[PDB]
Design a protein around this ligand. Structure first.
Ligand SMILES: Cn1ccc(CN(C(=O)Cc2cccnc2)c2ccc(-c3ccccn3)cc2)n1
Ligand SMILES: Cn1ccc(CN(C(=O)Cc2cccnc2)c2ccc(-c3ccccn3)cc2)n1
Lengths: 304, 304
């Protein structure tokens, strides 16, 4: 028992982290097979922050201008190319520590672990969620760019995120491993609107089921609701509207606890309308939305 | 910017995890050099839960009765011994993935990462704190025993905790790597009092400084306090009394932000007496005490 914001064991990703340097700029790179993936802004200068012409900047760079170091061993760069907002540096050596891996583009509401890195070295790991507005609330300082988000299915690492930017609002933005930004964000030092952030309703409900499993049941009530009535409340409180797909994914948790999804929705409704009244749920005084239904089942069954 | 409950990259510990089986019972073991460390209750049966005589039980066991598997490779056991509540199985092969390591006994209030394991395999990593009452609020199911807590200073892993037990109250208890339990806990299926848990005051203050650095400054006020006045409030709210040693450790954070420790204590005083009034600090609606002053500086400076 006990519920925690648990991240994946980061070992498989640690063995992929390298340091990429181009000119005076240094960030992190991801070494899988004979390719090193990193944010394309590694080629920018102090002036090219406002409106960089990446195609024009990259033309001034040769394979020998990109310095890739894995710990203390230098990788020989034999090719370079730009794919959307990421650079792909072909190196002459396949990473011996390359795990089974996939490049996947997660949906808003899905969660992933981030292995924060500086100068190609791991500093820490934490669990994050891709917000509905496609930002992430991470912990990233200058030099952390290139750090990746991932998920693990037994032996396969699905890399979903690469860190690129911190918005003036203090939230984080980045790309999938094909260099496509999540959201409308651009890799330039310009003010960018991260739209209205909504609460991931299916995740809050999954976390309420995790709480019931662990003994925290004070919030359960004698009421039920409908999907239409619930969404009237979700709307008012900037929660994502619950769909039948969400209900279906919560099925295993409803089956495990014997509490119908619409009954759990009614508990969430009263929690939204009345608050916690100074109480806690799983050691939290707010409604947590960073555990997917999949995360709850994984943690409550011990999936390794 | 951004603050997260960040755990250490678990890679170095992953390479040490093995599965230990004795009879029908299976738990996790820790392989460093030619020794495998695991909880001594691996030798217990379904009846020997209430009052096991570990010395008598261990006498019935030979080296060949302890099965140690690292992934899928079987380790040959050449020695076995009991040190307090841990078993030390001498194996004929030194772990090739043994990192630089130390066995350290942490103080209450200190934090560490836990790499949760099942059948010798890593499931996830999370940051924890040793509560003042020597329990930990972890996430552990049956089979997780043997999972370890640790800290990392560049290349050296300091193993501080080994998971052994879950109290009837749902909190967790375990030992240091010499098999000495933290707290008064015994490795038997008996109701055990985990004393009154107090809030780690120096950690809440360190986290208030982390919040100020990241923009969350609403709680700062025009007041100051004294150590004696503050402790009158800490007492009432079951907070650890602040000492001059605590003030001294918060010095770097006070210096960084220019907010005196007693001024920050006065903010904490008003937060304790008035609550958050429905606001949040670093995305939390309660006062967080699982970040030491050391953790805050590490995260706010990017120590790898
Ligand atoms: C062009 N561009 C793309 C994104 C950005 C904005 N940007 C960031 O937000 C990085 C960041 C900071 C803290 C936490 N997370 C991320 C950032 C990137 C790089 C440089 C930099 C510095 C010297 C030379 C060249 N490039 C400075 C600023 N600018
Ligand atoms: C003797 N003893 C020491 C500690 C305990 C209590 N105990 C736990 O609390 C384990 C636990 C559970 C869930 C999360 N964290 C930890 C636990 C240990 C082992 C066995 C077990 C089962 C079959 C055969 C032999 N031994 C059952 C229960 N009992």
């Amino acid at each position: 028992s006990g519920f925690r914001k648990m991240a994946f064991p980061s070992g498989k990703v640690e063995g992929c982290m390298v340091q990429v340097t181009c000119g005076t700029t240094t960030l992190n790179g991801l070494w899988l097979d004979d390719v090193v993936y990193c944010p394309r802004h590694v080629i920018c200068t102090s002036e090219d922050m406002l409106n960089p012409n990446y195609e024009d900047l990259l033309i001034r760079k040769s394979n020998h201008n990109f310095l890739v170091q894995a710990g203390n061993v230098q990788l020989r760069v034999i090719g370079h190319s730009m794919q959307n907002c990421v650079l792909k540096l072909k190196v002459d050596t396949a990473n011996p520590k390359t795990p089974k891996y996939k490049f996947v583009r997660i949906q808003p509401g899905q969660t992933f672990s981030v292995l924060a890195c500086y100068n190609g070295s791991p500093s820490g790991v934490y669990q994050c969620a891709m917000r509905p507005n496609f930002t992430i609330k991470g912990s990233f300082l200058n030099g952390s760019c290139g750090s990746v988000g991932f998920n693990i299915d037994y032996d396969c690492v699905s890399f979903c995120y690469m860190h690129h930017m911190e918005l003036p609002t203090g939230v984080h933005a980045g790309t999938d491993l094909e260099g496509n930004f999540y959201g409308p964000f651009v890799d330039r030092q310009t003010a960018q609107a991260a739209g209205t952030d909504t609460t991931i309703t299916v995740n809050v409900l999954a976390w309420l089921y995790a709480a019931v499993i662990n003994g925290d049941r004070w919030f359960l009530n004698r009421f039920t609701t409908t999907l239409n009535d619930f969404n009237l409340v979700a709307m008012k409180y900037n929660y994502e509207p619950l769909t039948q797909d969400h209900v279906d994914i919560l099925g295993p948790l409803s089956a495990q606890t014997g509490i119908a999804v619409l009954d759990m929705c009614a508990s969430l409704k009263e929690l939204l309308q009345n608050g916690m009244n100074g109480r806690t749920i799983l050691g939290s005084a707010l409604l947590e939305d960073e555990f997917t239904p999949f995360d709850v089942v994984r943690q409550c069954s011990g999936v390794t």
